[model samples]
Target: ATFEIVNRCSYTVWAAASKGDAALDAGGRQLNSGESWTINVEPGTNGGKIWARTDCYFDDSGSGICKTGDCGGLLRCKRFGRPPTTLAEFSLNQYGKDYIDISNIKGFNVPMNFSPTTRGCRGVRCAADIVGQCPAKLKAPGGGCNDACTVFQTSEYCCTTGKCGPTEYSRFFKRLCPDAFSYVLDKPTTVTCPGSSNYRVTFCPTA
Candidate 1:
């Protein structure tokens, strides 16, 4: 499958992907506003996550840190990123379809729209101003909003038991991005798209 990552934000963004060590090898790229990068994902690969880093400073050799969504202070990521950033996830070629999702479970740093370019597929968007409206306790550096799981770290917010109910923080995230996975057990977490369809992830989507 092809994944197109488009940057619509006013600032430069470092887009990164993880869980692709075997499929895509989890790389990162620097994209300015209005630029897009296309990546190919191998079939049968699951749990692929894409996120963006903001206010980052990297050296010529791709070594540095980002204000949000930094992975081991390296420009190219082989693993999951740090907290307080929006996520676009995929489970490709699963059960004859692809499950795509826009998740705020890690938290929100930018507005995102994850959708298929093909027909008969519904997309998910999380463009709410979560940072501005975030509770003081959950506020993080670089204008990112932290999630309850990152701060509280309890079973209520983390859902460690694999079954749990909503919490006050989950309500906050769900209210902001109704289509996103606010927590571990968030309902309607993913939407189905054709296995052969190509998807796009728009960062800071205009609407």
Candidate 2:
């Protein structure tokens, strides 16, 4: 009969399990990932047990990361007796160190840390909503661009227009980041000024 699989986490599970002879061990064949399966255990006979391994790496070394649940690096277990028991449970540390429990998953249905992109920008650039005006144009209490009288300069003056201008920058930004509604920068940088000149910050929204 169908077994009622409950998602113990606050979210849904993308997991996998395997049903095979315990003696044979078959290296915990991939049964589910981002999905589940129901084994048909008969009523009278000894309910056969299945070892589950979720989020397995598609490789030979058996080394990879799990998207969800506990069976991250080794094989986990599920069996039927008088009271069903989960054998070989893995901890966060034990996941990859010991045998690979393919069933070990992270938080259920949590989105991946990064998304695929054709553009060359690196490290988790997602289409997140912008929360405020561009960081360079933050205004003061009077609702005007903060005129802090900051002056910044460089030895070899680079073109602050077209390729480096605010419009081009904004265009590139909008093209690449259309969904961003706002932006903010919480930190400031203090680098050694070039040629011993005073360091000043500019509000070049177009730069």
Q: List model 1 lDDT by residue over 99-196, tens digit each.
A: 88988888888889998988868999999999999989999967699999898888888889888998888899899888899888778777988777
TM-score of each: 0.94, 0.20
Worst 10 residues of 1 by lDDT: 18-27
The global C-alpha lDDT for each of the candidates, from Candidate 1 onward, is 0.87, 0.23
State the lDDT of candidate 2 residue by residue for 65-162, as single tens digits.
33322343433323211110111111111222211111101101111111111222221221222112323432222121211111122211122332
lDDT score, residue 65, model 1?
94
Q: Model 2 segments beyond 4 Å from truth?
A: 6-35, 50-55, 59-85, 88-207
